[PDB]
A paper describes a structure:
Here, we report crystal and solution structures of human NFS1 in association with ISD11-ACP, ISCU, FDX2, and FXN, together forming the ‘core ISC complex’.
Two ISCU monomers are bound at opposite tips of the NFS1 dimer. In particular, the C-terminal Met436-Thr455 wrap tightly around ISCU. The Cys-loop of NFS1 extends towards ISCU, but its tip (Cys381-Ser385) is disordered and not visible in the electron density. We conclude that ISCU binding dynamically changes the NFS1 structure thereby facilitating sulfur transfer from NFS1.
Author numbering:
A (entry chain E): 54 to 379, 385 to 456
B (entry chain F): 4 to 85
C (entry chain G): 3 to 73
D (entry chain H): 10 to 135
E (entry chain A): 55 to 380, 386 to 455
F (entry chain B): 5 to 85
G (entry chain D): 15 to 132
H (entry chain C): 4 to 75
The structure:
């Protein structure tokens, strides 16, 4: 009994594309067979759907169908890539390279590996959020077994130079994994052009169903990986357990739709992103954009509104579903790119998706300008600066 | 030529898309149909036209089913809808 | 009102009200293609909360035709 | 976000500032922006020791804003002695603050005390 | 072409329309991430999630806080076995399980053996049930975990779970059970059965595929090392986005099951009896695998003498069934000492919530017919019917 | 009231008969039958009202799920001739 | 596939003939047991052939087509059977190709009786 | 064409020799109200009709049902 707020949080999750649901429902109603039942049609048709979906994912990323392994999500996928490569080459190589802005599942997998006696190097990013290739080159060691860098950041939408990293890891004979959860279906990906050895894919980030993902494990020059989920040997023994047919069908449908609609979606999402940022800045000073605007996915916009607290502004926007880069600690990505401590609490993340309308954008810009102005009239920092006081005024204490 | 079939189909798809309860699906569907037809207007190959038409019919079925489901499990409107 | 057709068409085809003469055709005078006219007949159905069968809808090619149909 | 924490937020009482150069105004500027919350609370004291006016400006979440707004609201017509007995716990209970949001009440109280200390520090001889 | 009848409920079950009707709102409008704490799209999703958790808990007699959502009973079994084992590694390196456990349990124990653990695989008696004396005698000072499944997925035998609970409690050993085939079909009280961990699969109780749950007792806290590293969702026991539509589906399925359990058990009992009784009065040399006294009537495994499993399944082009033929024979059937020749002559009938008596009678008819025919084609049937003893001839 | 109960029985049976899926149809019909027939000798008015309310909710479910089944229908079972 | 539940020459001959060959190859522990019987003409040609096999549908088909092919051939033309021809003729995958081997093992075994029965 | 004597015969589980035209469903044919609702439904299935509660409630005897079908 109340109007719902606008959804502007696409990086956290996306709605089902009605085409995807229409693809799934038959397997939620009549085709409920187990894809591993080899002795009857209920199984044959289900398996058929599954392999078809596998082909769809493969076509979206330029891989062979045999290289796609179905998982529960990009989290499991990242665990499989990192822990799989790490555990497999343990007897001979115990060093990994990743970055400080990677998703928490990558970082925490690396954490547990450190607990098991592995050596991890977390590459720092530049102020722009992009890594320094020279540092990656200098970091690789003889016993380096894996290099993991994410394609698109989920907090500031920065695009890492995936191809160049592929070159380096190839010429240095080191496995390359990438967490493409925020890039699949939004920007082009060719595993061969980018010389990628493992890739993580999340279904519910591309308007597919929740609880299903995929991991690409290159087979061309075979990449070896130790499986984590023990069982009956499903998914080439890389992921035992019953393959959830409706979910994988959904994933395939989402990847096919994305393959078709990518250019269109990117054109109009680019337009909307420009509209939002341009309009907000032409009306509010001291709003900085986190992330190099040259290498950036326009769907994810992180803005720091000077002198206004994140939670307060989010609460003033009770009509727009937003986020502020998350627990009870500050954003580690914003600290990694060296954002001033004071501004770490003054950033929010607008997500412009496939279904976002121009009305939604202009509305969010309205409430944003209005409430940033109001909260600035209430802010003691805005008063101190506008009154000539320098933020280096050690009158701080607790 | 194929003008009649294409137009009647355009009518069916727009009119049916307008019945989405969810704001996002409705707006997206309408805008997408518009942009699509307007972009594929200058196609002369009849085989390419027939391909586009067949895909358009399948998408029509999808739209019907999904609008009906959306109505069965509907929710409240967005603040933007007044 | 009743000639509020002149509003619909005006906003639908994006043309100043001074151009929506009763004797003005959608395609020739108001410069619209057939897709525009499909959207237009639909818009009329939405406004007056009616339903124009395809038989008589094809006839609607001029402002006076629409006004005559609604009345 | 309790109902009251809603009402004091974007419906706030006494948002502004007084003249820090008065000998009758007490300014407490407590907090730190790296930690998230910064409260500036000012008061005006009567010849008879009553608080006649009070304003605030805080940088922080809606709960901290509520704590500060309710703070100035309460400190209005009380004596400097009757004000020192605010007790953050009374603020929290009056606003229904969960555990993770309890720091705000502390900052508010530390503000009241700080401002009173400024005023009492301006009244001393030379 | 007309579709065949479904008799393979142990492999998977269709969605109960109530479960789908419960899910769809979260597949359409309530697409919020349950971990988005800053807007309604997240709050409503989380609410649905906790509601489902309470539903599962009520079905198994547990506290809501003790339920952890997983991707399926496979992940649950990995979490229980490898989690418990890895956590108490510093002091206990021995595990006890049985030879009839599901392959995910057996293979988890295998990998643990690769990690330096010792596993004891109890044999089952000819009836498929374990010997409690053998289980007590198996426990060692460094035994950290005992894993026994509630109901077997191949022969439907019921293990004496409660007594195992007593034993493991009095010996201070954690008790885990893979109840994937028992939830919603037979009663389960985690406190009465003194259970420390339990695996739950959604698509075995007419819930959606790709979702499961694990019960980890908190009363006498059981510590478990998490396998999936991440942001700390599910109390850090199972990182990753909780798929709300799936968990909602699972909760609805568990509640529906809690309501319909008695009814389903009555009618499934009737149907199972009808099937077995009718089949045996018409075909000689038809053996039922599993102690008929302690057996869940939903899973019936029968050995049809002198007929190969695959051939019979193929003659039943009208009924979706399963067997345990060969690229290896059923290890459950070997564990209960089934004659080697008969290991290839067994099939598995599953009678579910929606199975109709018509379906049963059809399966009985076609089954008798094609077993008779294939017996006319069988050289073994000729050898026995022609007085030669199959226990003597030279093979190969 | 008795009238409401009877009409409800009629509605639930007639709507269940419309399931496309053979299993869903048979189960729905039989379950409604056994359910009503089982609660026939209930005298408690509160229990009667509760049962009726649950029956109404399940009726809504039956409607929606029947429509869904019709939208995504498939071929019949060999058993249906 | 076509030969299963559509079999050619399913049966048995009289093992007491001095002109009929009975080959019973296989084993029930391994899964497949093929019994192939043949009748030899005065001119050394195969006059009839029947079979009875215990195994999957692939072994059954291999046996039906087996007897069908061993029908009008000379004792010499049978020794050149080669299971591979069976595999190609039925398009059997690797895991089910073993049946062809058993099929071959059957033909020779029957011949082994015939040459041993003469 | 009172093949109703079959429907009722199968519906209430009573031999056709019992279906007297002057026999009431509850008194004579020994059926409860649920049985009778299922009965009107079944008749609708056979003769492919639709009896609103107004005229359906009246159906209490064989002659009533046969007469209704003949009309309508
Ligand atoms: P008018 O000026 O009289 O003429 C109209 C037409 C276009 C028929 C005529 O001008 C013409 O150009 N004819 C030749 C070209 C032609 O036939 N084009 C047909 C294009 S068919 C097409 O574009 C199908 C695209 C389908 C997109 C549907 C989007 C699905 C959205 C689903 C939302 C969930
Ligand atoms: P009549 O001859 O007058 O008989 C008297 C009757 C029974 C009609 C009535 O007066 C009476 O005696 N009532 C006593 C109690 C009662 O009326 N109970 C009625 C409600 S009980 C009920 O229907 C339980 C709910 C059934 C739900 C079906 C679930 C199926 C779900 C399928 C989903 C796929
Ligand atoms: C959202 C997200 C995930 C989570 O994927 P799941 O399928 O929910 O497990 C993983 N990685 C990244 C970068 C994500 O943005
Ligand atoms: C079916 C089954 C499983 C599979 O559960 P998933 O969700 O597919 O992993 C696990 N254990 C048992 C005993 C099963 O019967």
């Amino acid at each position: 009994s109340s109007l719902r707020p606008l959804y502007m949080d696409v990086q956290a999750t996306t709605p089902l594309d009605p085409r995807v649901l229409d693809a799934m429902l038959p397997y939620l109603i009549n085709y409920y067979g187990n894809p591993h039942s080899r002795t009857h049609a209920y199984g044959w048709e289900s398996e058929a759907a599954m392999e078809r979906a596998r082909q769809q994912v493969a076509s979206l990323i330029g891989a062979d169908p045999r290289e796609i392994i179905f998982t529960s999500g990009a989290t499991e996928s990242n665990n499989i890539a990192i822990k799989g490569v790490a555990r497999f080459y343990r007897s001979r190589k115990k060093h990994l390279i990743t970055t400080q802005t990677e998703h928490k599942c990558v970082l925490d997998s690396c954490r547990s590996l450190e607990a098991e006696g592995f050596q991890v190097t977390y590459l720092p990013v530049q102020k722009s959020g992009i890594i320094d290739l020279k540092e990656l080159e200098a970091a690789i060691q003889p016993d380096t077994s894996l290099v993991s860098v994410m394609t698109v950041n989920n907090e500031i939408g920065v695009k890492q130079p995936i191809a160049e990293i592929g070159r380096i890891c190839s010429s240095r004979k080191v496995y390359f994994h990438t967490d493409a959860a925020q890039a699949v279906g939004k920007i082009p990906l060719d595993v061969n052009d980018m010389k990628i050895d493992l890739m993580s894919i999340s279904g519910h980030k591309i308007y597919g169903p929740k609880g299903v993902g995929a991991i690409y494990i290159r087979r061309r020059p075979r990449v070896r990986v130790e499986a984590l989920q023990s069982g009956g040997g499903q998914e080439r023994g890389m992921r035992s357990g019953t393959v959830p047919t409706p979910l994988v069908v959904g994933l395939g449908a989402a990847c096919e739709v994305a393959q078709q609609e990518m250019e269109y979606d990117h054109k109009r999402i680019s337009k909307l992103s420009e509209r939002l940022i341009q309009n907000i800045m032409k009306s509010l000073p001291d709003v900085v954009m986190n992330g190099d605007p040259k290498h950036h996915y326009p769907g994810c916009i992180n803005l720091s509104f000077a002198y206004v607290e994140g939670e307060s502004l989010l609460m003033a926007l009770k009509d727009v579903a937003l986020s502020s880069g998350s627990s009870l600690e500050p954003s580690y990505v914003l600290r990694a790119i060296g954002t001033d401590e004071d501004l770490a609490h003054s950033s929010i993340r607008f997500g412009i998706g496939r279904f976002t309308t121009e009305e939604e954008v202009d509305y969010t810009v309205e409430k944003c300008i209005q409430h940033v102005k109001r909260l600035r009239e209430m802010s003691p920092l805005w008063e101190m600066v506008q009154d000539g006081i320098d933020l280096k005024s050690i009158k701080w204490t607790q | 030529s194929s003008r009649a079939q294409v137009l009647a189909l355009y009518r069916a798809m727009l009119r049916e898309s307008k019945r989405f309860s969810a704001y996002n699906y409705r707006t997206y569907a309408v805008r997408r149909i518009r942009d699509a037809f307007r972009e594929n207007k200058n196609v002369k190959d009849p085989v390419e036209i027939q391909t586009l038409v067949n895909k358009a019919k399948r998408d029509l079925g999808v739209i019907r089913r999904q609008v009906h489901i959306g109505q069965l499990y509907s929710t409240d409107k967005l603040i933007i809808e007044n | 009102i009743e000639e509020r057709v002149k509003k619909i068409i005006g906003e639908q085809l994006g043309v100043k009200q001074e151009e929506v003469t009763n004797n003005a055709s959608f395609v020739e005078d108001l410069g619209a293609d057939s897709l525009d006219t499909v959207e237009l007949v639909m818009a009329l159905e939405e406004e007056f909360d009616t339903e124009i069968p395809d038989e008589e809808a094809e006839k609607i090619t001029t402002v006076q035709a629409a006004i005559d149909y609604i009345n | 976000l309790s109902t009251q924490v809603v009402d004091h937020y974007e419906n706030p009482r006494n948002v502004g500032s007084l003249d820090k150069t008065s000998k009758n105004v007490g300014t407490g500027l407590v907090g730190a922006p790296a930690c998230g919350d910064v409260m500036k609370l000012q008061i005006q004291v009567d010849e008879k020791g009553k608080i006649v006016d009070a304003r605030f400006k805080t940088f922080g979440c809606g709960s901290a804003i509520a704590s500060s707004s309710l703070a100035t609201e309460w400190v209005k017509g009380k004596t400097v002695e009757e004000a020192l007995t605010i007790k953050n716990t009374d603020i929290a209970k009056e606003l229904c603050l969960p555990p993770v949001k309890l720091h705000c009440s502390i900052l508010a109280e530390d503000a009241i005390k700080a401002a009173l200390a400024d005023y009492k520090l301006k009244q001393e001889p030379k």
